[PDB]
Amino acid sequence: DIQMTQSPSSLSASVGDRVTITCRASQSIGTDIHWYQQKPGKAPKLLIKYASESISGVPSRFSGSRGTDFTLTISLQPEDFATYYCQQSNRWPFTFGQGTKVEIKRTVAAPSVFIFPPSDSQLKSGTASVVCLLNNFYPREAKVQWKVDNALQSGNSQESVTEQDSKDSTYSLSSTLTLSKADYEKHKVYCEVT
Amino acid sequence: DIQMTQSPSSLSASVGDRVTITCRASQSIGTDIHWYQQKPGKAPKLLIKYASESISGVPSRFSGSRGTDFTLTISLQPEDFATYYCQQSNRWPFTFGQGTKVEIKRTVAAPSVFIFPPSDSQLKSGTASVVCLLNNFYPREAKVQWKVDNALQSGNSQESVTEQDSKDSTYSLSSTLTLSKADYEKHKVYCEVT
Amino acid sequence: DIQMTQSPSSLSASVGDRVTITCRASQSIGTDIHWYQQKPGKAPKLLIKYASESISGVPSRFSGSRGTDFTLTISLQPEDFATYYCQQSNRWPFTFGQGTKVEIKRTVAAPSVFIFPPSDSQLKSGTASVVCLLNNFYPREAKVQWKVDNALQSGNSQESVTEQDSKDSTYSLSSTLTLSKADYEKHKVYCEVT
Amino acid sequence: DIQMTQSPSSLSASVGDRVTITCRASQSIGTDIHWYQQKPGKAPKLLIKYASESISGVPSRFSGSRGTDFTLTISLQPEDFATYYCQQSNRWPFTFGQGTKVEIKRTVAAPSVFIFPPSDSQLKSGTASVVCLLNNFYPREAKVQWKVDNALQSGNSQESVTEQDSKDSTYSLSSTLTLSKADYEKHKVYCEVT
Amino acid sequence: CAGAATVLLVIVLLAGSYLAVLAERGAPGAQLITYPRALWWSVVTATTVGYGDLYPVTLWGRCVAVVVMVAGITSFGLVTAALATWFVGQC
Amino acid sequence: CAGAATVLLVIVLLAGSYLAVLAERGAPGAQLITYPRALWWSVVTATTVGYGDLYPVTLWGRCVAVVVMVAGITSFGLVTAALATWFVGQC
Amino acid sequence: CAGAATVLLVIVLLAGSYLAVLAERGAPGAQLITYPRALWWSVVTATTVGYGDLYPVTLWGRCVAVVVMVAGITSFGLVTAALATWFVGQC
Amino acid sequence: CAGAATVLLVIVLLAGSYLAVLAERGAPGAQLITYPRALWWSVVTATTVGYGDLYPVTLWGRCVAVVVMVAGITSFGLVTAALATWFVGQC
Amino acid sequence: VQLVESGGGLVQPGGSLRLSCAASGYTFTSDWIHWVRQAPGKGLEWIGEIIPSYGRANYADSVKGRFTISADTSKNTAYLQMNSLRAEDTAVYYCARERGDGYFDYWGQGTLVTVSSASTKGPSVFPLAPGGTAALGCLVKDYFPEPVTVSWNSGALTSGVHTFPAVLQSSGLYSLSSVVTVPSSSLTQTYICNVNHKPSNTKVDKKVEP
Amino acid sequence: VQLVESGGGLVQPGGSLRLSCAASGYTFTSDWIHWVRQAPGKGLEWIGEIIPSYGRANYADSVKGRFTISADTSKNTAYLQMNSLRAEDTAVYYCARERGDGYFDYWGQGTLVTVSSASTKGPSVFPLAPGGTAALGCLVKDYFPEPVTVSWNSGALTSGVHTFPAVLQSSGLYSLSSVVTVPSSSLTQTYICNVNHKPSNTKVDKKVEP
Amino acid sequence: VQLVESGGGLVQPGGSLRLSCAASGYTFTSDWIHWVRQAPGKGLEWIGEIIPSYGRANYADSVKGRFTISADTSKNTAYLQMNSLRAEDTAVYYCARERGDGYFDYWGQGTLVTVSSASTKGPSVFPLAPGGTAALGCLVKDYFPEPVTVSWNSGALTSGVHTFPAVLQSSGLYSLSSVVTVPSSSLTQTYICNVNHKPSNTKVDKKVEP
Amino acid sequence: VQLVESGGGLVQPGGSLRLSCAASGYTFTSDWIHWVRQAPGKGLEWIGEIIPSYGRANYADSVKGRFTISADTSKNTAYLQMNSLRAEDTAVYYCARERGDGYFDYWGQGTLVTVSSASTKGPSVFPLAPGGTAALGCLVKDYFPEPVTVSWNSGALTSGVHTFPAVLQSSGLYSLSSVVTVPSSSLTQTYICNVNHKPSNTKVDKKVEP
Ligand SMILES: [Ba+2]
């Protein structure tokens, strides 16, 4: 079938920089390529039609050009952290590219931390999930361990990272440490992030 | 000329599994490809015409789709042990693919054995063909040797394996050991299969 | 331009055998290819027109077929030792292939030998060209040396090999040994071929 | 887009020789290729239109021919030291090749030399640029050093080479040695070229 | 009279463009699968010009194409003789 | 009168489709080698539309093609003027 | 009368050649982007011959192409019937 | 009367086939460079069918092609109306 | 001219679901509704299209003739009948309007369809109670399947809120962790996290005092 | 509308055979009969085609102008004249109907054509006589060429029967081995293996008591 | 039918300049003026084209919609409005006539456009004073930007003159070195090098006696 | 309908020769005469073509506009004007008829054109005099250039004759060696080798007794 090869998967370009995204069609698809912004969790939003034509509402920073190599070019803003998508209409059926995650780059920003002990309402029912929060940091890369009575925990340490604030372009993290209420009652002292 | 490259030659897929077969044309043949079941020894039986269209009588498990890559897909039954064949009609002359042997997979089944001494009607005329039978086994792989007075025979040991039962999908085997009626009269004790 | 790649340059096939010759066009030239026999020294003789059509007079052993691969096929005779040639007419301008020397194969045949001393009419005018003849041999491969008073000559030993008899398909050879009439008068004894 | 690949970048062919220049188009551009002479510093001058057609005024030595491989051929003069350029018009937009510097070849010719001390008008204002001239030499390759009181200078030695005389096809060079008027007053003796 | 012809042509065109695109989706590699380009297709057809950029690969498509020709060629041909006479009658 | 034309056209079509496919087999890489697609070929022809998907590579084919044009163009042209007058005479 | 037709045709041709080339530049890979070859294009069109070397990829182009057909087919068709009658009336 | 037309057409055909092949040699990659295939070319042309196998790449060629259309389209069109009336007048 | 989707949650492997896409907009004679799919952390997959006008609807050999697409023109809706489901089909499912032109001007909201043999459950929901801007949150523990909805104050509060991704507990049961960043002067202000699960018809609300 | 083939067995290398394909069915004006070939343990090879209506028939440069194809429309049959045979041509030969459409709706049964200089012979046929389901068979020894036909009881019996592939004896002479699986209560039942060889006009029948 | 260009010298990175191309020749209804570019020691780059007649003008994604092209038909001139300049745009800028045919029959002279944040300056100009043919020259020291014009005797002298390439002083300031080869009998003849810099409106002339 | 060629032998590098191709046959209105070339021990090279009717004649960029092709229709001949020759052009030169169809039905005989600065010379011609079939021959020593013609008995004898290839003597001068195989009863029979060199207008004949 017709293969839109988007290039490249990921972009770490700094804000205000110029950013470009490439859709090599397998064959001449004419000018029948369309760009789509799909923000984390929302539905796609057609950014470019017929390779170059723009839609009412889409910012002026967004333009598309050209052989079988099609391009979408950002002259870059915080709202623009998205995956960008590429759509054939030359031949049946329609086809998308793999898509390109842009990720915004900015100056380092160590996080806020808020440790959270397990709810009494929980503690009665066997486990003790302990929480530890990492607010609005940059970059992604962060290491949070657990110790108890200064004996390091690898048991049951479970991380989750958010999608970048659409203005901040920041990462918040949350690490749980689920324990047996037995292991929780034994030593009751609680996250030395790095 | 136009080269239908079928893929792959052989399939050992288990029954009820989903099975697919690929015919890469050398060039765009349009939609002018036809699939044919040819069962061991019988004549071909057109399964698909014009890439996707089905013929009256062919089961609903059989469907064909699509670029230059054409496919025949089995969603698999015991009657289906066959070789499958692929036929161009875009350009003169017509062309077939190499064809794909499907072979059914099922649970292990050690064989029945029936040793057969050489007929008196034979024995008078020089040789003594001794037979040994291996009924309805799975898999193919089986080893049958000959000993006589416990001295192992490699002389004149001749195997033949049947085509899989079209319901059982089983293999029967038969190994002859042709001997001089001289060598047969010397030691008259007769197949320890493995 | 359009590149007729003939295959292969040389053929040593035995007489009566079947022989084929291939003209891969660089692109589809339609059916616009022509075969030409050009015998050593004579002018080309169109053998096939429009890939398959034959000309009045050309033997029935000569036929041509076919994609971009064009073929000339000999089902082989002694008169057929030639170079065979291949001609495009699809696009301007016309093009030939490199051409294919056929050479006939037959049973070994040691040559006749006739040594020839230098003419008196010559001997008066400085040099003494001495000749040695090798009639109707097969194969080509032959080694003829010169000795004089049993001291081997490499000085001024000059070979020439004929084109194969168009019935015999045989090779005759002639080796000259030009000498100073001085070196000729010193030792007057004269070719031990192998 | 359409890629005119000119071949080769540079030519050192001797004068009167035959010289050729190649423009491989990425695809068939029809016959829609044009050659342009652009002499050092002046504007391009269309030499060939439509691959083969010549323009009024252009010498008879200039001709262009041909598949996707287009050629410009010089049968060579001193006025011809230029870069030559190659222009598509088959598809929008227009395209040039990288271009080919020709450089004329001729017999060796050691240069004239004229050393130049720093102007009094200069000397008052801090630096002392000392000059050394190399007139109408061949080839390019020349090495000019500086010594002062026979201690070799690498400090602040700055070369410039001219474009070949359009008749002479010769190279003149000029090397400056800018100095502190302090370092100039210390040792006042001044270029042993090679 | 003639307005009938133009519209009638325009109608056929809109019809055949519609139908061919409808008849042509679902067929892997069908070219003739958006109305805009179906429309261009439908035009190049009824003019008996017929350039080869675009055509139906499907059967039903080609039957669309047939109707389009018969209907279109006539309904177009009507507008051609209309502008000849008009050119003729004046001059 | 006109039914004569339609059929006569349809006949020619069936004839030329038949013949071209017959004339075209045996030639390596002939496209125009099954009646269905010979039929489409034969249509695109007599309409003087002529799209370039399909054509005879053979000589005999092209002579089929010739007969098809002469016969077809006329027999088709007959059906076109028939539906013009009908459109004309009413309105 | 007929000279009107020839010129009128020639005019349309020069117009459509002009326009298509104008409408077609700027579109990456447009073929129909020089007057000479726009002119050939414009001819092959109004003759309802239509060979497929060249065509508008742009929208505006295709609308040029449309006008060209309507205008051209008629203005050409005028010159064809002119040389038929002339052939007819004499013989 | 009509025989005049057929021949006159056949003439034009033989002429244009001749000329195009003559006009087309010398141009690297010209397709339209042997009379047989020039002849087929010349036919597919005057029928306003125009399939795209073959065409002039040269200028002079295309001017051959022009003359061929004008002359051919008319001289062919003459034979078409001849076989319509004959079909008409009888039935 | 927006698009409103409905149906879709958990199904037995080999089972069937029907998804909906309501007109809610000036819709023409001849719009194709399409259906596009997004596997968890994957690109998009065109699946299906349909004219309501003539009811003809083409599929993808990946959904083969496993799915059907229906068009009730009276309700001005198109549907996605879903037979023979596989673990692969685990994904989120957008419809889209395409006006015969070849791009998607409008889109449905997207629903999640989860294919598994491990059955349903519900959320535990433990408070995470709390200087300046302090933070407070609430777990939503041991869930299946992913549609999980959390706003604070029936929606009212939105700021400094980081409602986290869902983690696959080693057990097999989506628990998550909602978070808010607020000023410490607020304790004096009502804080409650509303946890809706249309699948398990939940509406849990927990109160977060220190 | 079935197809019935005839002729074909053993030929001298360089010899000639004529194969037949009888109509036996509603056959139209314009069907091409084709000829397709299967070498021992090989794929299929399109060879030839023919309209009976006009008698024109195209070949394959592999059968070059070595074979001819004939069409007696009165007998409603098409034929395959076979000159200049080679060891390669050793194969089985199907005709097929193709209604100008480009696939093979119906097929002839297939005959075997064997090309060799080693001449004919016939079968020896030794009984293999015999708990529950016991087995009994019968050899068919030292044959040439492969068409070998074995049924039990003039055909009557079919079950548990494994009539084996043919082996090339080191001598050069097809022997095989027919087998049946039957219940041991049967000895009390008549068991006879019918060995037909149209090539060597054989009809051997052997009786298998213990 | 020649072409005359004007404007163009130094601009702030992100600034704007307007370049000119005056008709000066029998110019037709429908000529495209094009704009071609040459980076320092680089090939040519097609940029832009325009019909004056209808004012439509296509660009290159390298000059994107960064540049505009204008056509005052009354002045018979076409222009090159230059927004959003980059260090890349540092280059020399030819217009060209193309009569709808696809090659460039005529060309403008070429002006240099220099893009930098380092501001302007002017030339020092030190004499290089001087057997047969002796040589004399004159420096032109510490300049910015490159357009630098030197003739001898208001132009009069041209022979044996090697006016050298410009070197980038380690400081950042174009100095060059003009040279003449003359006969030594001339000292008795007036020698003066005229150094024009339209950018820094200079007209320096220095006298070279020994 | 044969073709007769004339001219062609030795030329100075950069010199000129004119080759001829006379009709000698029913020749039509519109035949192209072509010119084809064979370098010593090399394939063929299409060079040129011409209609006599309109006199238009296309060349090969290898013969560029170095050669011209002429057509005197009154003499029914076409010619090959040969300017600017190179050592490469050393070759043999066939004309050919092609009836607008694209193959060469008839051919001229072929003449040799030799390009060199080393001037002409002539043959020495030494007898090689001589059981059964004995052999006798005759050298033809130290020649230039290659056209060398040898028959025995003004042509009469042809059998057992091996007239050898030409060798390049280390000197630079074609000598060869004619040979005949005859019966020894013949010495009693007249044996003379006729050595013609149109280039050096030779007609040497030598008598071979023992
Ligand atoms: Ba047409």
Side-chain angles (χ1 to χ4, degrees), chain F residues 3-63:
Chain F
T6 311
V7 166
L8 169 66
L9 174 70
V10 179
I11 299 163
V12 174
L13 282 148
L14 301 160
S17 172
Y18 193 132
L19 294 161
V21 151
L22 162 74
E24 270 263 304
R25 273 107 192 302
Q31 260 288 89
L32 182 49
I33 80 172
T34 77
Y35 292 118
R37 84 177 84 126
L39 201 42
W40 191 42
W41 175 76
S42 35
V43 158
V44 166
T45 312
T47 47
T48 86
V49 176
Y51 282 123
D53 38 46
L54 277 201
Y55 53 70
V57 306
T58 73
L59 157 55
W60 265 79
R62 289 160 183 194
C63 323

Side-chain angles (χ1 to χ4, degrees), chain E residues 48-50, chain F residues 48-50, chain G residues 48-50, chain H residues 48-50:
Chain E
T48 86
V49 176
Chain F
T48 86
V49 176
Chain G
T48 86
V49 176
Chain H
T48 86
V49 176

